[PDB]
Structure formats: C-alpha cells, structure tokens
Design a protein around this motif. Sequence first.
Motif, PDB file in Angstrom:
ATOM      1  N   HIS A  77       0.820  -1.202   0.000  1.00  0.00           N
ATOM      2  CA  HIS A  77       0.000   0.000   0.000  1.00  0.00           C
ATOM      3  C   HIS A  77       0.854   1.252   0.000  1.00  0.00           C
ATOM      4  CE1 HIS A  77      -3.625   2.326   1.663  1.00  0.00           C
ATOM      5  NE2 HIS A  77      -2.611   3.163   1.784  1.00  0.00           N
ATOM      6  N   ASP A 125     -15.340  13.607   6.040  1.00  0.00           N
ATOM      7  CA  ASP A 125     -14.378  12.537   5.808  1.00  0.00           C
ATOM      8  C   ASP A 125     -13.698  12.099   7.104  1.00  0.00           C
ATOM      9  OD1 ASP A 125     -12.100  11.078   5.155  1.00  0.00           O
ATOM     10  OD2 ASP A 125     -11.867  12.125   3.235  1.00  0.00           O
ATOM     11  N   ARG A 139       4.584   9.898   4.581  1.00  0.00           N
ATOM     12  CA  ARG A 139       4.728   8.443   4.502  1.00  0.00           C
ATOM     13  C   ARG A 139       5.581   7.857   5.622  1.00  0.00           C
ATOM     14  NH1 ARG A 139       0.357   6.544   2.378  1.00  0.00           N
ATOM     15  NH2 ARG A 139      -0.242   8.210   0.931  1.00  0.00           N
ATOM     16  N   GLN A 196      -4.382   5.006   9.821  1.00  0.00           N
ATOM     17  CA  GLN A 196      -3.354   5.892   9.280  1.00  0.00           C
ATOM     18  C   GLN A 196      -3.937   7.091   8.531  1.00  0.00           C
ATOM     19  OE1 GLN A 196      -2.198   6.691   6.118  1.00  0.00           O
ATOM     20  NE2 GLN A 196      -3.543   5.426   4.847  1.00  0.00           N
ATOM     21  N   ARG A 253      -4.074  11.539   9.720  1.00  0.00           N
ATOM     22  CA  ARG A 253      -3.564  12.502   8.746  1.00  0.00           C
ATOM     23  C   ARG A 253      -4.623  13.487   8.259  1.00  0.00           C
ATOM     24  NH1 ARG A 253      -1.498  10.828   4.121  1.00  0.00           N
ATOM     25  NH2 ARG A 253      -2.190   8.649   4.085  1.00  0.00           N
TER      26      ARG A 253
HETATM   27  C1  LIG Z   1      -9.639   8.796  -0.722  1.00  0.00           C
HETATM   28  C2  LIG Z   1     -10.869   9.717  -0.676  1.00  0.00           C
HETATM   29  C3  LIG Z   1     -11.456   9.838   0.743  1.00  0.00           C
HETATM   30  C4  LIG Z   1     -12.075   8.515   1.264  1.00  0.00           C
HETATM   31  C5  LIG Z   1     -12.796   8.737   2.611  1.00  0.00           C
HETATM   32  C6  LIG Z   1     -13.618   7.529   3.092  1.00  0.00           C
HETATM   33  O1  LIG Z   1     -14.329   7.893   4.257  1.00  0.00           O
HETATM   34  C7  LIG Z   1     -12.807   6.299   3.416  1.00  0.00           C
HETATM   35  C8  LIG Z   1     -11.546   6.259   3.866  1.00  0.00           C
HETATM   36  C9  LIG Z   1     -10.764   5.008   4.235  1.00  0.00           C
HETATM   37  C10 LIG Z   1     -11.589   3.729   4.361  1.00  0.00           C
HETATM   38  O2  LIG Z   1     -12.280   3.718   5.595  1.00  0.00           O
HETATM   39  C11 LIG Z   1     -10.594   2.575   4.256  1.00  0.00           C
HETATM   40  C12 LIG Z   1      -9.464   3.150   3.442  1.00  0.00           C
HETATM   41  O3  LIG Z   1      -8.514   2.501   3.045  1.00  0.00           O
HETATM   42  C13 LIG Z   1      -9.685   4.638   3.208  1.00  0.00           C
HETATM   43  C14 LIG Z   1      -8.408   5.475   3.419  1.00  0.00           C
HETATM   44  C15 LIG Z   1      -7.413   5.479   2.246  1.00  0.00           C
HETATM   45  C16 LIG Z   1      -7.897   6.390   1.106  1.00  0.00           C
HETATM   46  C17 LIG Z   1      -6.808   6.634   0.063  1.00  0.00           C
HETATM   47  C18 LIG Z   1      -5.576   7.321   0.682  1.00  0.00           C
HETATM   48  C19 LIG Z   1      -4.438   6.317   0.937  1.00  0.00           C
HETATM   49  C20 LIG Z   1      -3.314   6.901   1.772  1.00  0.00           C
HETATM   50  O4  LIG Z   1      -3.033   8.082   1.675  1.00  0.00           O
HETATM   51  O5  LIG Z   1      -2.712   6.155   2.521  1.00  0.00           O
END
Ligand SMILES: CCCCC[C@H](O)/C=C/[C@H]1[C@H](O)CC(=O)[C@@H]1CCCCCCC(=O)O
Length: 1175
Positions: free
Chosen positions: A130, A719, A823, A871, A875
């Motif tokens: 990831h 969010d 990161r 995580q 953030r």
């Molecule tokens: C990416 C757009 C916002 C999504 C918001 C939504 O509520 C979900 C977020 C979580 C979900 O619960 C599980 C998951 O993997 C999402 C978080 C990761 C979104 C992409 C960003 C990855 C990163 O920056 O590590």
Amino acid sequence: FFWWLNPLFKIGHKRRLEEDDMYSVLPEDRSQHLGEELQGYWDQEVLRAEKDAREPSLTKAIIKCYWKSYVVLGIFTLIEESTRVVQPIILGKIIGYFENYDPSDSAALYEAHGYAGVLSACTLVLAILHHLYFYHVQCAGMRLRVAMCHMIYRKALRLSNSAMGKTTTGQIVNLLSNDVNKFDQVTIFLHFLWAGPLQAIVVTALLWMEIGISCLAGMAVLIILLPLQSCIGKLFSSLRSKTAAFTDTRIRTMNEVITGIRIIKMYAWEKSFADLITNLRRKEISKILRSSYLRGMNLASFFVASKIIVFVTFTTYVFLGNVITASRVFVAVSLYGAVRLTVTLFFPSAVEKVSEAFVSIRRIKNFLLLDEIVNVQDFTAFWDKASDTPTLQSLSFTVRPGELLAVVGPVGAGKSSLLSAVLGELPPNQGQVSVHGRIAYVSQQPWVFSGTVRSNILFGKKYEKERYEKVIKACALKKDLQLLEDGDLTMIGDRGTTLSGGQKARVNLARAVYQDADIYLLDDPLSAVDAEVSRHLFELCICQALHEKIRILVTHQLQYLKAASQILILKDGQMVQKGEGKVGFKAYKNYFTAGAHWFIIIFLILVNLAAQVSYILQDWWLSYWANQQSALTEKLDLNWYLGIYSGLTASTVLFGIVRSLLVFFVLVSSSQTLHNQMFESILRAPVLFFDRNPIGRILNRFSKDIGHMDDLLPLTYLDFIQTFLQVIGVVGVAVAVIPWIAIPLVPLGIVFFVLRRYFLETSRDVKRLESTTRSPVFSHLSSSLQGLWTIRAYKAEQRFQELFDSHQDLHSEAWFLFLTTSRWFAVRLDAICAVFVIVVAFGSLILAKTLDAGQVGLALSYALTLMGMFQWCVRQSAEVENMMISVERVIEYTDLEKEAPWEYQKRPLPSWPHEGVIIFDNVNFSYSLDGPLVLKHLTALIKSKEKVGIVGRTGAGKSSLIAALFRLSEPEGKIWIDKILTTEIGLHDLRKKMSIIPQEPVLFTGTMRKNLDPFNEHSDEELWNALEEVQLKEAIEDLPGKMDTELAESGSNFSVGQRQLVCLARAILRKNRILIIDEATANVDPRTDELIQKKIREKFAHCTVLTIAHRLNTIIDSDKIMVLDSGRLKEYDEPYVLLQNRDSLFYKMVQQLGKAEAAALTETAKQVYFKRNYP
Ligand SMILES: CCCCC[C@H](O)/C=C/[C@H]1[C@H](O)CC(=O)[C@@H]1CCCCCCC(=O)O
C-alpha cells in the motif's frame, strides 16, 4: 521505510525546521529536464495532427510521454489486491478452529498459530505494498504538474501581442494556481480502473465457492451502484465547473470594491455593491449547496454500500433454505470489504478526477495553441486588421549613430506604435523595417521585479562598481539609495509597490543604461520625475553621455526638442512633419454555532452516534445470529431474526444519508453566515483599516479562506468524522469482546501520543515551508508576463526560464519533503496497527477457552480494517487543524471596529442643504487617534455660491481637508454645514449632498448605466442630456448599444481624459449645491483639461465650490484662497490681494513661478480684480 528522514525529525525537534534543511530531489526530477520530456512529444503530436489535417490531442502527448513508467506500478496494484483476497480465506481457517474447537487437540492449537502467523504476514506485506504504491503514484503526479508548468511558462514568454487581447494576465495565472493542481489527483487512482473490475470478478468466483448462487445478488447491487456513482461523478463536475463563472465574477467585484473602497465610500454607493455581491453570492451558494449534497451522497454511498451489499446477499441465502455459520458470514463480509474499497471509492474517484482533469487539459490545449542603422520606409501596419484605419501609415525615417530622434504627438498618435515597429512587435503590412545593433527598450510603464534594485539594474550583466556607480549617479539614483536603509540590497515587491513611481522608472532606466546597448528607444522616461531631475537626466544622461548612440525619444517635453538632431510629428497614425499556528476550542464552537440553533448541532451529534451504533450493531447481530444457530428438526424463526436484521440495516442506511447531508447543510450555512457578517464588517470598517493593510492581504480572506470554508473544509470534516467513529468502533468492539486487550492497548496508546506529537512538531514546519515556497512561483509568472515586452526585447528569455525552473524545483523540494514525511508517519501508524492485529489474533488463541466463534469472527473482522483507516484518520486531523487557520482568519474580520451609523435618529430636512454655507471652528484632524495632528486650530467660513480653493506645501493637510468634510476619520472642533453640526448628521446624510471629483477616476465593470446611475433615479433622457453636456455622445453612441452597453473590463476601452469626463458626468448628474474639486492628475491631455475647467465654471456657476489645486492657474478665478502650511491655516484671502501682499506666502510661492509667469499673473490678477471691483 524512509529511514533517511529520521535525523531530520531529530533536527526538527531540537530546532524549528528552516528552508535550507530539506533534502534536494534527484537530478532526474530537475524542472528544466522534466519539462523538455513532454515538450518534445507535444512537438511531435503537433506535426502528426498537422499531416493528418486534424486537431492535436494533448492527451496523446501526455500518454506517449509518461505511459512507460506509470504502467510499471500496476505490479504493486496486482500484488496488493491479490493479498486483499487471500487474507479473508486464511481468516476463514482461523475461525474454523473455533467453530470445531476442543481444548484437548495440540495439533489443532499449533495449526491455528500457523495461520495466525500467515494472517500477520499478509498484513505486513499489504501494509508495505500500500505504501510503495501510493508513494510512487503521488510522485508520478508531481512530475506531471512540474512538466506542465514548465510548458505553460515556455509558451507564455512567446505569446502574440494580439493573443494578449483574448486572454488576460489573471486568467493565465489562474492556470498555474487552479488548473494544473488537478493533475496531482489524476495519477493517484488510474490503476484502479482495471484492478477494481478485475477484483470484482475474482471475488465473485470466491464467493461462489463460499456461499454459492447468492453471490450474484451482492454483485447485482454493485452493478447498480457502479453506473450511478459514475453518473453522480459526472454531474458533480458539471455543477462545479459552472460555479467557477459565478465565483470569478464575485472575486473580480471584490477586487474593484477593495481597491476602490475610498471612492465607493465617498459616493455612498455601498448599497449598490452590497446588493450586487449579495446576489452573486446568493446564486453561487445555490450551486454550492447543490454540488455539496451530491458529494455528500457520494460519501454516504461508500459508507452505507457495504451494508446493503451484505444485506441483499444474506437475504437470498436464507430464503434459499441455508443456515448461517460464522465462518461463512465473516469470510463473505471480509471479501466485500475489498470490493467496497476499490470499486466504490477508487473507481468513482478515478472517474471524477479524470473528468475534472479533462477540464484542465481542455483549457491548457486552448492556451498552448494561441498565436505566437535603423531604417523604416513606406511603413504601414495594423495592430488589428479589423481596424478601419492603420495605426501607422506611409512612415519613412532613418537614424544613424549620434543622431537623436524626438517622437512627438498626441496620446495614441502612434509614437509607442512607432517604437513597437522599431522593436518588430508591429510587423509592416506595407513598407519595410531594418535595424542593426542592440536595442534598448524603455517601456512606458516601468517594469520592476522582485529582487534587489541592484538585481533589477544588473539584469544578468556582471557587477562593476565604476560603471555601476556612474549609472547610479547618471540616472540620479545615488541620493535615494543613500536614503534607503539597506542600500541597493533593499528587497523589492512583486511589482515594486514598495517603490515610488519615479523610483521604479529610474531603476528601469538604469537597467537600460547598464546593458550598454547600441540603439536606445526611450519611451517617455522623464515624465515620472520633477522638472529639475527631468532636465538633469536629459542633459547629462541623454545629451552628454548617450551622445554616441542612436536615440529615438517619444516625449512631450518640448523643452528638450531643441537638443534633438531630428523631430518626427505623428498625428492620427501618419507622419505630419519631419525635421497563527494554533487554534482553540472557541474557534470550533463559533464555527459550528454560527451555523444553526443549538437544537440542530445537538441533533447532529445524536444522528452521528445513531448511525455508527447501528453500523456496529448490524455486524454484531450477524455474530449473534451465528452463535444462536450454532447452539441448535428445529430451526430459527426468520420472521424474528430476519425481521430485526432488516431494521438495523434500514436504520444504518437512513442515518448514514441524513448524517452526510446534514453536515454539509450546517457547515455551508455557517460559511454563508460568516461571509455576510464579514462583508458587512468590511463595508462599514473605516478607511484607516484599509491603509493598515495591503489589498492582497484582505482579498485573500475572500478568495482563499471563504473558498476553503465553502468547498473543501466541510468535506474534510465529514471525511474525518466518518473515519474517526469507525476507528472508535474497531477499538470498542475489540475491547468489548475480549477485555484483556485493554492492557496492551495502554502502552500502545502512550506510544501513539508520543509518536503523534513528535511528528506534528515538524509537520507544521513542512506545511508552512511548502506554502511559503509555492507563492514565489506565481509571483514570478506575474512579473514575467508584465515584463513580457522588455524581457523579450533584451533576448533574456533563457535566463527567466531558468529562474522559473529554480523556483519550481524549490517547491518540488518542499513538496518532496512533505510527501516523504507523511509516509514516514503513515508507515509507522500501520506498524502500530499491525501490533493491534497481531495482539487481537494471538490473544484470541491464548484465551480460546472463553471466546466463541461469532465473537472471534466479529473481533477479527473489525481489526483487519484498521490498517488503512487509522493511518488516514490521523492525517486528516492534521488537515482540519491546518484549515481552521482559515476559519480563524475570517472570524477576526467579523468584528472590526465600525464607522459611526449611516443614519442617526436625528435627521436633516429633505431640502437641507438649502444655502450651501460651511463653517470651521477651531478644528483639528489626524488620520488615526494615535497619530500626530495633521491639521490644527483651523477656523473659516464659506458663504453661499462662493468660489474658493486650497493651496500650500505637500502634507499641509490638503487631502485631510476633503477627508474632514466627509468625516472619514472624526474631527476635533466643529464644522457646520448650513447652520447644523456635521457630527450630528449621519454619514449617509453628509457624504451625499456634496460632490467630489477625484484626482484619479474609476470606471467600474458593468453598464454605462450603472457607472452613471447605480440607483436608476435619473430619467432615461437625462443621461443623454448629461452625456451631451460632456459631449461624449458621439463616442459612446458607437458602442453596440447606445445606452445599457457593456463597458470593457475596468473601462480600459476609454482614455484618461474620457474617463475623467465620465466623472465629470457623474458630477453633472447629481444636483447638490456643494462641490470640492480634487487635484489634477498626471499626463492628462492639454486640451480637454481646459474644456473641463471651462465647463466646470460654466455649468456649476451656481454652486458653492472648493478646490484642491495641483497647479495654481486652475483656481486663480476664485474669490478667496486658503493657504495651508505645517498643518495650519496661514492665509485665507483673495488671490489678487494676496499678490498685493508681497510678504504673503501666496506671493512667496508665485514669485517662484518666474518673471514671465509672475508678470502674466500680475496683469491677469489686476484685470480680474478690476472686473470684480466694477460691480
Ligand atoms: C480517498 C478519498 C477519501 C475517502 C474517505 C472515506 O471515508 C474512506 C476512507 C478510508 C476507508 O475507511 C478505508 C481506506 O482505506 C480509506 C483510506 C485510504 C484512502 C486513500 C488514501 C491512501 C493513503 O493516503 O494512505
């Protein structure tokens, strides 16, 4: 794992981080190189499209540029998504050991531990994949943006002078600021457009194995959602793009308001712009509520969707005669978690962020495809062939070394167009131009850019003290630099706003001289300095020093033409003759409470908790149903179990949607309220507040900070809150099923807050460093575009391109530190999550005597989610805490001190002012209570229909007197107007009923109607009468409409004398008895000024008239004149008698005008005195 940052975190805890501390990006990402890679394939694409006789596609260039590198990263996507489908199948085996448990079996106990190790291994593999994927796609996105901005800058250097007529500087700068930043979001998600659907098929097969034919229903809902969420994604982009037309029009109105606010006040027009902004804002929020509710339905689709998909699946499964068991249910539930993530978030996010990018690629394609001895003979050229007449016709001239050519004639005669022809910016339609030698181009508008004044002078040339100092003295610059504290190393703003007009002009001119060119094209360089300095610059620099060089000098200073070797007079385009950092709970409470009555905000909290509790309780209900079924021919009554189950899913769907919509409603209502409060406060805030701030510092609140509050911030809260309450859910279900977990959690919680704090100490440094590094880029572009002419003339393009790359790669360093730091932090929160998943899995196997299958299935099914969720949540919290600086920056403006009420309960008679008398009693004034008195002791009387004016030294209070009559800052002493005290009538009583022609005019964007009558009180024919009185009729009738025609932006289609005549028209329109005339402004034409003075005397002959005289002749008709000095009334007497009193200050000034003008004034004074004496 980004270990190379660890010492920087140590440094950033021992110290505040600073701009030198960040690690540089690879030589491979240097903006200079990175742009040329895409420019090359755009050249090739233009060639191909040409030969095919087709429109080129910038999408073609971009794919043919980046596709090789970006398709490699799909390998991570494949192994990531392979792990997400593997991990549930192992989970099925762990729960199996519980379903068939017995304490006696050693081999089983060992087997389960083996799977617990594999499940833990999968989790760590998935965590790193990831992070390797999401880190690389964000760097691919950053590269694309840098290449873009290099190309946009490369083109803009070389644009056509005609193309500048069809796109404004601000729109080009909007490309970088607002259009290119959509690209960073393109690259993040594209690989899900194929991994999502592929994973859907793989999961469809696995679920067929787990729960058979029912697998279709779950996927059926998913293929209802996948179109629908894509359709919503398209419509969202349609709505959002239409708002940009309103928002940009609103912001351009705010700019002319805040730039003009003195005059808007003086005319009492505040009602007009209040209504106009209120209507644009009321339209804009009509779309932003709508666009938000769509986006809230998209996020409420992700949240709820997984519960619908599971519900339809198990609904069919029990009607088909099956019985639930915990291994089946929690395997099935876990697999849908994979498809939910990729298909519902990342496929819609890809679609809508690709869709949004095409709006940017479309505009950028439209920009990139825009147009792109000295001897002259028979020259004729048109700036625009559409023009009926040439801008230059039958021009022929030549100039050779040592000759000085004076270019003379009216404004718009073509003098600058002549220079443009010499420069080659105006190509001949007939005739020819030939030039040999280096040009020195001195633009009429001085060009000054950020740096040192010495950097402005050197302009890439080597520093040499002797010639440099010779320039500094020859351009009459030594004194100023000695007055400056930092000398020639003083910092200069984007446009030299920190410098006087003559300063920027002289710096520009010094730059020109420093280059030591061959051909000097001097475009009116002396108009911005006083007559002494003007002739010093002409005689020493132009006549003595530049003597050996060809000079063409566009000038109105006839005093110097005698020194010119040759003079060229142009008329009507042809040759006539040739001879912070932290916020507190208060700012959160205000931001929410401003939006609604407390009944709403407490209901919002009960809806959130109800949604989350129902979401948890659905899964608990499955687990409970599994236990029950596992306790048991006899069978469960589905009408009970399937009954209650239907309720819990129904409540989740309902409160999920209500929750998402209501947050946007409350927070957008909040932003609507705070905008109007802030806007009312900015209108009624006194002028002093607009002197203690530069325009940009205010306009940033309305452009950026309201921008965050409307669009981005309410999404970020939703969010965060959807995520955060699920995190509390995971921990709460784990702790409720197996309490012993509370013990490990404690140390782990301490580690979390130590980790969190140690990161955040640096985080607010990187965010600051990034944000401060970004702005200089847009600054440079603006400076460059302004200097487009000159930079081009000097052949300086390559240096400026390299400078833009320098700024751009600086921000690339800042951005690269931001990426890597985020990161480093996110990696270790996943490591903490891995410790949580490990402890849950192993602890469950330790305590196996106590738990049961459904309980363990629930505990694990939750804990597995935590990796991505936790995580992200932390953030997002750092983003909310950053954007609350916006909400704190607007809240402080909502309470600025107010000017006294527009109206008191005391009000004057509708006929007041009747007589037009004014009296001053012992008045004193200063612009601010803390300041020195600028005007003091003053007492005077103005009678009905008298004509008088104000003279004196600068700073004597000339501008203060007009400021006092308007009570722009309250007076000491008393002023009476028509026997009533000015402090006792409201500002809308007082600032109306007097008239004031400003020194510098303003034309507001809109109709000639509005610019003359914002109230529509004057009759339809009266404007034609008034327009005829200024004789503008025969010009304005040429517009597309005779009246109600659109003006050009800022009225740029009218010349300064016409603009001033529009202000004279405003004066003609309103009928009030009292007039103050401001000082005459610079470079007005020498014919309409006398017309204005004549017409003023002719028409307003029945008014009481004051004036602030720039040059005395403008008021020598007056009855009496006031003489100010040092902020005190020295003299108030008839100009004639004043000249009789040779000891008078008035005479002591007039004596300075020279013998000839003194004698002329003497005789004309005697004559007008006689005329006044006769009656
Ligand atoms: C990416 C757009 C916002 C999504 C918001 C939504 O509520 C979900 C977020 C979580 C979900 O619960 C599980 C998951 O993997 C999402 C978080 C990761 C979104 C992409 C960003 C990855 C990163 O920056 O590590």
